[PDB]
RNA sequence: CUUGCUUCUUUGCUGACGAGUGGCGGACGGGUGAGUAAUGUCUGGGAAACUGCCUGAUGGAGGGGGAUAACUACUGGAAACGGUAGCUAAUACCGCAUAACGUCGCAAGACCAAAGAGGGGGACCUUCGGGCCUCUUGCCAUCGGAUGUGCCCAGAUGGGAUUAGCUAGUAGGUGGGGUAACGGCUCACCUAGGCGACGAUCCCUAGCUGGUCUGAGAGGAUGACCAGCCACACUGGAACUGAGACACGGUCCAGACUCCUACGGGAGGCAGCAGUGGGGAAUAUUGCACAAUGGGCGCAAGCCUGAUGCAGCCAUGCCGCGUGUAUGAAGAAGGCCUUCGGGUUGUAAAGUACUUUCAGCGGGGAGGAAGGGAGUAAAGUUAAUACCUUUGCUCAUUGACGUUACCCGCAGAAGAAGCACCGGCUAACUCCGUGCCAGCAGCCGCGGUAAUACGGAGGGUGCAAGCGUUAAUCGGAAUUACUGGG
């Protein structure tokens, strides 16, 4: 089963997640098909806080990927009319 | 080892007779048709093939056979019974 | 009428103190029978009990003069007192030292005259010896039959029950039939007429030359009751259990620096008594015997080390069910635990949940410096450079390290250092160190002075220091004249004894 | 980290004035300069190639207050930039925060400027920095916070700033102690005496 | 007995829930590199394939039966752990109907499956068990998509020729069987082939790689931590269940080692997290919590998670800060040298004026927090303003770290500096004590009564909470020369 999920990179007390498409049986930092965008939870207001390419995400939705709760919250953050 | 999920062991014991017993009767019907191959009677071979076909397709339906083993049995056994006839 | 205090009342303490060669081990082994649980004297054992009515704990101790530095601080743990006195031994200097201990805290005392298979003097002579050499009265209840091997019965007065005895019952639990009456001529025929008349005359002398029982004066221990019977014949200790239920009170409050903390409050007061010389199958854990009389346990409770002031989470707590260190179990307050300490907690380190005060314990003494460690088979010194430091935190052993890295002194407060020599033959103990005669005299008085002033004290005689168990530096003790020069040197100190 | 010792013996050892003991007072002549680094100062050394390279390295290090490993890191950051290594190394040494505070006149000596940076007084772009290893970006503004402004220690030491060259690549306000950083310094502007070529030849091996 | 205040037997009728049947997970997560020189890994292709959980499309989901655990009565065993005789349910099991682009077959033709549950309710109908209407979810069959796994070929991936012949299911073919699938994968027959000096067979060693260190580059060692694959789970072998294991915390058999026994027989496998014995020079805590991520199950709430998020220890490595700053000559006391004039330690110390970074104490205090629960409104759905999905909106809220990061205040320079070297290489000099003795040393080497080399004193130099020694890799070493030697 494919899924779109965060990967938990960064340092101790310095999180930096990687939204990525991967199988559920693989590891969190393990093998992935391809990466699309990123998220930084400590990215308070500066030049860039979140990049997220919606084309490949819509392509993986067209394939059957299960979106997790944080990635769905990022989809509701990157709104089509906002 | 002590495990709360040891139920999958003895239930597989509950499997290893019954499903295999079905497999048992399956292959004996197949062997019966081989007796017709050692008999030379094409009518008895056709009767044995008609007897073994729906039960081996039912065994292919219940997850025991992946419907390519039994397909191979139907194929080569049909080839034998129309080469003999 | 909450059940919490109702089973606080069902938790009682009797440790066991006696003379050497009196029968501690046999009577504890036979009280293991009475609850359906089942050199000389080098261990301490705790038996909680699977007993029916209450749950009364035990706490054994080595009985000698060179031994029994355990019991000076664990008779403070135990509310009551059991005495075991033999007739051939009598009231000796061991018993006078134990009564000097027990008079300081006024413990209720029930005594038990042991060895009824041997020869025993007259009972009035023994009670006069007790009441003269202890200056403490007594009230007898029974007296068995005759002298020598003729002891075959027990005659109660406040219970009016006459029991008989059968021989050879040390292995199995057997019952002897009951005769109710006191003036029964069939009892005189079964026992012997003239001996029973002598026993009735002695009971009349008891009724005419003694007193009755008390309840408010039993708490102070002025008139201490006695009990009779043997420890091998499976007979005399079976009647002890009813007295343990009926006579012993609730576990008393104990003194702190502020006031006495009762057995109905919270903030668990379980400080550590011994760090006992452990048997080592795979681990040490050292031991933690405690005083958790106040407060019912929790499985995930978080204790507070007061002397280091740290919130330490301890979830594992061993209960001593029938001697074996049982599973992770919580209990009712009035019990003694065993925890898993790794070089962190010494003797008497207090515990509360925020009351940052101290008790009035630690009666431990100053040692007498015996010889050395000279390390025969000098391979792998690390088993004694670690495993004797494991024993150095204890009240009996305090290892002294001089600067020259050889000739390490074993601290003994007693004389018999055969305990450590036998303890050198364990899984992590393989070095022999046979003894000889080397003279180091007087006790190494431990002292650690305040800052900016002990630095020059280290500087002026830098070849005359010695590391201790726990990173201390006493001075060095070769003679009394050097201690006089040390007192002449004026080491002003925030003094702590550590002994 | 810091030397915190005989900051006057080092100028006698190198011979040139390292500006460690600058102070409110002028050129001292109170330590018998150029003729006594120590006990055996009358000796004339052989003074070889590795000798003059090491003396040049120690001279630049005790001018700029940088330790050996940190200066090797600055050389690694100098060899990677554009242009040439020797100009880049001195630009990185000038880009230290304490050197900027020293050129502004906010403190008499360099150690006093380092102490002024360290004790929560020097603030660049509204962000306070205590460690002197901050790489000063171009087009910044350095100042002193109001709770640490003019407790006289910046004041008289500013008068020494009236006696210095007052270089072109930075401007001080001198009314509210608000400096202004500008473009990177040219090689032909900073002190005109120190030799980067011996440092390059030393760290090339 | 304060007669609706309390005491209390029945009662699955509810919220929920030991044990049992069943579904899923246990094949992921975690640990080690023992074995392995190609059955492994990497790079690049390929077909003779499977694929639960995810999802799209098209149809079905009709009608029945028999057992069984749990539960009862007896009974074997100390325990582990059952047996006999009955009762019962299911999404457990098995037939019957029914099929298509599904399976076989050149076609005609033959055969192949299931399971229902939860919420709300208008009319009708209620033997008052409920049908019926709607929504959600689950099941069966096919075509697919993605993922993961299985399989084949080429190249590359250590040394030894003091390893030159190896192979008999061996090499290939035909036919039978077997695998989700090609396949000597396995059997019957036929021929004598197949590999090999461009290192076949044998021995030793070794997990492979992305990468790490060094090196201008080419190269050399390594691959410990992060990550992918492979292999293993005290040793060996074997199968079942399951889509996926020929299986870490599954089964059986054989062997070794601890433990119990009432001695008839059984329990166990830390190369999991912790922790222990032994080895070694060398390596940690028997800690907190699902607060966040991920995994498993459930519609959801909730449950587990020694992965993880952390906490404790170790200067093991890197980085930063401090141990005061300015001023201060009688150029004080003491030490060392001396040509005994004086110099050095030395603005160093004492004194004076400020400051308190970091520790100690006392108070505020973010962020890692998204969600989830209750209530309300609107839009879908439907007969339905009822149920359910989604979005605003109101309330109570969810932190182990945590006595948190960070900020303010109190006090007092107050609590905080060592290690190597000094003949050259390579940064720095004298005096005293032995005397080819004690001794130093990485190489030239010193010490034989005037030692800048041993030991001590003073001083200086270098690094800095680290400093020296030892061990390993590379460079210098073009002293392995392919770049780049004879
Ligand atoms: N016949 C008989 N012998 C007894 C009795 N009680 C004790 N003994 C004997 O006396 C000796 C006491 O042994 P032990 O139980 O070790 O004494 P102890 O009191 O534990 C010694 P310590 O005071 O040091 O702890 C043993 O030899 C034991 O057999 C008794 O009631 N009868």
| CATH number of the domain encompassing residue B68 | 1.20.58.110
C23 is in an annotated binding site: yes
User: Three-class SS of residue C352?
Assistant: strand
Q: What are phi and psi of C26, to 5 degrees?
A: -65, -40
Give whole-number Cα distances, D116 to C20, D18, D19, D22, in Å: 77, 20, 17, 16
User: Protein D43 CA to nucleic acid E328 C1', in Å?
Assistant: 32
Among protein residues, the one with the nearest Cα to ligand 1's atom 17 is C23
Whether nucleic acid strand E comes within 7 Å of the CB of A75, the answer is no
Give whole-number Cα distances, C469 to B76, C276, C415, C498, D56, in Å: 88, 16, 19, 10, 55
Element (DSSP H or E) covering residue C319 = strand C318-321
- Residue C20 CA, ligand 1 centroid: distance in Å: 9
Q: Dihedral, CA atoms, C263, C268, C271, C277, nearest 10 degrees?
A: 100
- Residue C481 CA, ligand 1 centroid: distance in Å: 46
Q: What are phi and psi of A17, to 5 degrees?
A: -85, 155
Residue spans of beta strands (DSSP E) within chain D: 122-124, 127-128, 142-144, 170-171, 180-181
CA C206 to CA C166: how far, in whole Å?
A: 26
Q: Residues with Cβ < 8 Å from D64, sequence gap 6 or more?
A: D71, D93, D96, D99
CA atoms within 13 A on the CB side of A14: 3
Residue D19: name the closest of D62, D70, D66 by CA. D62
Q: Is A58 exposed, middle or buried (0-12, 13-18, 19+ CB in 10 A)?
A: exposed
What domains can you pick out in chain C, each with its CATH number? Answer: 1-15+42-81+248-361 (3.40.50.300), 16-36+82-247 (3.40.50.300), 362-499 (3.30.70.3280)
Residues C111 and C225 sit within 8 Å (Cβ to Cβ):
yes
Give whole-number Cα distances, C169 to C145, C232, C235, D153, in Å: 18, 8, 8, 98
Question: What residues pair up with C223 in beta bridges, in sequence order?
Answer: C137
Residues C32 and C38 sit within 8 Å (Cβ to Cβ):
yes
Residues B73 and B43 sit within 8 Å (Cβ to Cβ):
no
Ligand 1 near C232 CB (within 6 A): yes
Question: How many separate domains does chain A show?
Answer: 1
What domains can you pick out in chain D, each with its CATH number? Answer: 7-93+190-203 (1.10.1050.10), 94-181 (3.10.290.10)
CA A10 to CA D114: how far, in whole Å?
A: 33
CA C235 to CA C114: how far, in whole Å?
A: 11
CA D126 to CA C310: how far, in whole Å?
A: 41
CA C193 to CA C184: how far, in whole Å?
A: 11
* Residue C351 per-residue DSSP state: E
CA B74 to CA B30: how far, in whole Å?
A: 10
Residue A48: name the closest of A38, A35, A58 by CA. A38
Whether nucleic acid strand E comes within 7 Å of the CB of B78, the answer is yes
CA C353 to CA C38: how far, in whole Å?
A: 38
Give the structural domain span for B46.
Answer: 1-85
CA C286 to CA C341: how far, in whole Å?
A: 6
Q: Residues with Cβ < 8 Å from C218, sequence gap 6 or more?
A: C108, C225, C247
Helix H, strand E, coil C: the string for chain D is CCCCCCCCHHHHHHCCCCCCCCCCCCCCCCCCCCCCCCCCCCCCCCCCHHHHHHHHHHHHHHHHCCCHHHHHHHHHHHHCCCCCHHHHHHHHHHCCHHHHHHHHCCCCCHHHHHHHHHCCCEEECCEECCCCCCCCCCCCCEEECCCCCCCCCCHHHHHHCCCCCCCCCEECCCCCCCCEECCCCCCCCCCCCCCHHHHHHHCCC
- Residue C203 CA, ligand 1 centroid: distance in Å: 28
Q: Dihedral, CA atoms, D156, D162, D164, D170, nearest 10 degrees?
A: 100
User: Three-class SS of residue C178?
Assistant: strand
With left for phi above 0 and alpha for psi between -120 and 50, is residue C394 left, alpha or beta? beta
Ligand 1 near C41 CB (within 6 A): yes
CA D158 to CA B84: how far, in whole Å?
A: 117
CA A25 to CA C348: how far, in whole Å?
A: 54
Residue spans of beta strands (DSSP E) within chain A: 2-5, 9-11, 14-16, 20-23, 34-35, 38-39, 50-51, 66-67
Alpha helix segments (H runs only) across C163-317: 185-191, 193-208, 216-220, 240-246
Give whole-number Cα distances, C190 to C62, C164, C480, D27, in Å: 41, 10, 69, 124
Residues D101 and D116 sit within 8 Å (Cβ to Cβ):
yes
CA atoms within 13 A on the CB side of B11: 4
Residue C435: name the closest of C416, C463, C454 by CA. C416
Residues C200 and C184 sit within 8 Å (Cβ to Cβ):
no
| Ligand 1 atom closest to the CA of C40, numbered from 1 | 24
User: ∠D75-D78-D80 over CA atoms, to 5°?
Assistant: 115
Secondary-structure percent of chain D, ordered helix, strand, coil, rounded to 5? 35, 5, 60
User: Protein B75 CA to nucleic acid E283 C1', in Å?
Assistant: 66
Q: Residues with Cβ < 8 Å from C217, sequence gap 6 or more?
A: C223
Q: What are phi and psi of D109, to 5 degrees?
A: -100, 180
| Cβ-based neighbour number of residue C284 at 10 Å | 16
Q: Which nucleotide is nearest to B23 (CA to C1')?
A: E240
| Ligand 1 atom closest to the CA of C26, numbered from 1 | 15
Question: How many separate domains does chain B show?
Answer: 1
Q: Residues with Cβ < 8 Å from A43, sequence gap 6 or more?
A: A49, A50
- Which nucleotides of chain E does any protein CB come within 7 A of? 19-26, 28-30, 50, 52-55, 93-96, 102-105, 110-113, 141-142, 144-148, 176-181, 226-229, 240-243, 245, 249-251, 267-269, 275-280, 282, 285-289, 292-296, 308-311, 318-327, 344-348, 354-357, 367-371, 391-392, 403, 415, 417, 426-429, 458-465
Q: Helices C193-208 and C123-133 meet at what angle, rounded to 10?
A: 30
CA C83 to CA C113: how far, in whole Å?
A: 8
Ligand 1 near C23 CB (within 6 A): yes
Q: Tell whether the torsion through CA atoms of C267, C269, C272 and C278 is positive or negative.
A: negative
CA C245 to CA C52: how far, in whole Å?
A: 11
User: At how many Å resolution was this determined?
Assistant: 4.4
* Residue C83 per-residue DSSP state: E
Residues D117 and D107 sit within 8 Å (Cβ to Cβ):
no
Ligand 1 near C18 CB (within 6 A): yes
Residue keyed to tokens 């009670």: C127
User: ∠C365-C366-C370 over CA atoms, to 5°?
Assistant: 130
Q: Residues with Cβ < 8 Å from B26, sequence gap 6 or more?
A: B55, B56, B59, B65
- Residue C365 CA, ligand 1 centroid: distance in Å: 28
User: Three-class SS of residue A21?
Assistant: strand
Element (DSSP H or E) covering residue C466 = strand C466-468
- Residue C25 CA, ligand 1 centroid: distance in Å: 7
Residue A73: name the closest of A1, A6, A14, A2 by CA. A6
- Let me know how long chain A is: 82
Residues C111 and C24 sit within 8 Å (Cβ to Cβ):
no
Q: Which residues of D in 151-170 have their CB below 7 Å from strand E's atoms?
A: 151
Q: What are phi and psi of C225, to 5 degrees?
A: -75, 155
Residue keyed to tokens 């029968």: C23
User: Protein C323 CA to nucleic acid E258 C1', in Å?
Assistant: 22
Rg (CA), chain D: 18
Q: Dihedral, CA atoms, B20, B23, B29, B31, nearest 10 degrees?
A: -90
Residue A70: name the closest of A10, A16, A11, A19 by CA. A19
């Amino acid at each position: 089963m494919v899924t779109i999920r965060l990967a938990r990179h960064g340092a101790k007390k310095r999180p930096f997640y990687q939204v990525v498409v991967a199988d559920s049986r693989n590891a969190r930092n393990g093998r992935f098909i391809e990466r699309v965008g990123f998220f930084n939870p400590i990215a308070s207001e500066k030049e860039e806080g979140t990049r997220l390419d919606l084309d490949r995400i819509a392509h993986w939705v067209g394939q059957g990927a299960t979106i997790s709760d944080r990635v769905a919250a990022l989809i509701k953050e990157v709104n089509k009319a906002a | 080892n002590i495990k709360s999920a040891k139920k999958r062991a003895i239930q597989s014991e509950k499997a290893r007779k019954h499903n295999a017993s079905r497999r048992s009767m399956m292959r004996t019907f197949i062997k019966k048709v081989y007796a017709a191959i050692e008999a030379g009677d094409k009518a008895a071979a056709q009767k044995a093939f008609n007897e073994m076909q729906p039960i081996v397709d039912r065994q292919a339906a219940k997850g025991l056979i992946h419907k390519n083993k039994a397909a191979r049995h139907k194929a080569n056994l049909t080839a034998q019974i129309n080469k003999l006839a | 009428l909450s059940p919490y205090l109702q089973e606080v009342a069902k938790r009682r303490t009797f440790a066991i103190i006696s003379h050497p060669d009196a029968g501690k081990t046999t009577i504890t082994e036979k009280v293991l029978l009475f609850g359906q649980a089942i050199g000389i004297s080098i261990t301490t054992s705790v038996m909680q009990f699977p007993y029916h009515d209450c749950l009364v704990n035990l706490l054994d101790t080595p009985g000698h003069e060179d031994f029994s530095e355990d019991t000076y601080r664990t008779l403070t743990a135990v509310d009551c007192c059991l005495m075991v006195i033999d007739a051939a031994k009598g009231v000796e200097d061991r018993t006078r030292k134990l009564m000097e201990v027990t008079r300081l805290r006024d413990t209720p005392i029930l005594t038990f005259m042991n060895k009824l298979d041997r020869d025993i003097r007259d009972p009035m002579e023994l009670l006069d010896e007790v009441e003269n050499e202890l200056k403490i009265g007594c009230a007898p209840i029974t007296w068995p039959i005759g002298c020598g091997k003729l002891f075959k019965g027990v005659y109660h007065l406040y219970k009016d029950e006459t029991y008989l005895y059968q021989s050879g019952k040390g292995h199995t639990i057997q019952e002897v039939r009951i005769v109710k009456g006191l003036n029964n001529p069939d009892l005189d025929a079964a026992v012997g007429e003239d001996l029973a008349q002598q026993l009735r005359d002695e009971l009349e002398l008891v009724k005419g030359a003694s007193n009755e029982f008390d309840k408010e004066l039993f708490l102070a221990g002025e008139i201490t009751p006695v009990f009779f019977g043997t420890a091998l014949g499976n007979f005399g200790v079976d009647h002890m259990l009813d007295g343990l239920v009926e006579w012993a009170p609730a576990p008393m409050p104990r003194q702190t620096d502020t006031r006495t903390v009762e057995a109905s409050e919270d903030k668990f007061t379980g400080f550590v008594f011994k760090i006992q010389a452990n048997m080592d199958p795979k681990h040490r854990d050292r031991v933690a015997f405690m005083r958790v009389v106040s407060g019912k346990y929790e499985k995930g409770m978080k204790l507070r080390q007061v002397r280091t002031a740290k919130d330490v989470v301890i979830s594992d707590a061993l209960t001593f069910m029938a001697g074996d260190r049982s599973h992770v179990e919580e209990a009712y307050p009035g019990d003694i635990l065993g925890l898993h300490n790794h070089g962190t907690i010494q003797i008497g380190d207090t515990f509360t949940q925020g009351e940052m005060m101290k008790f009035t314990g630690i009666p431990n003494f100053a040692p007498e410096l015996f010889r050395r460690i000279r390390l025969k088979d000098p391979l792998k010194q690390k088993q004694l450079l670690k495993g004797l430091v494991q024993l150095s935190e204890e009240g009996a052993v305090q290892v002294f390290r001089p600067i020259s890295n050889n000739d390490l002194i074993v601290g003994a407060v007693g004389v018999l250092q055969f305990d450590v020599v036998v303890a050198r033959l364990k899984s992590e103990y393989n070095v022999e160190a046979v003894y000889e005669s080397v003279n180091v005299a007087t006790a190494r008085w431990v002292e650690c002075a305040d800052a900016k002033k002990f630095e020059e004290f280290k500087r002026k005689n830098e070849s005359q220091l010695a590391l201790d168990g726990g990173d201390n530096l006493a001075y060095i003790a070769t003679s009394m004249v050097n201690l006089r020069l040390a007192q002449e040197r004026y080491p002003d100190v925030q003094f702590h004894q550590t002994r | 980290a810091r030397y915190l010792g005989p900051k006057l013996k080092l100028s006698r050892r190198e011979g040139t004035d390292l500006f460690l003991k600058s102070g409110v007072r002028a050129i001292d002549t109170k330590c018998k300069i150029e003729q006594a680094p120590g006990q055996h100062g009358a000796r004339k050394p052989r003074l070889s190639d590795y000798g003059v390279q090491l003396r040049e390295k120690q001279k630049v290090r005790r001018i700029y207050g940088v330790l050996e490993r940190q200066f090797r890191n600055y050389y690694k950051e100098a060899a990677r930039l554009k242009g040439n290594t020797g100009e880049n190394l001195l630009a990185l040494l000038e880009g230290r925060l304490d050197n900027v505070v020293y050129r502004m006149g906010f403190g008499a000596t360099r150690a006093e400027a380092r102490q002024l940076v360290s004790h929560k007084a020097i603030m660049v772009n509204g962000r306070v920095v205590n460690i002197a290893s901050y790489q000063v970006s171009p087009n910044d503004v350095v100042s002193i916070r109001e709770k640490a402004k003019k407790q006289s220690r910046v004041k008289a030491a500013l008068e020494l700033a009236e006696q210095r060259e007052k270089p072109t690549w930075l401007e001080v306000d001198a009314g509210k102690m608000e400096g202004t950083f500008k473009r990177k310094p040219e090689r032909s502007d900073l002190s005109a005496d120190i030799n980067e070529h011996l440092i390059v030849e030393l760290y090339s091996k």
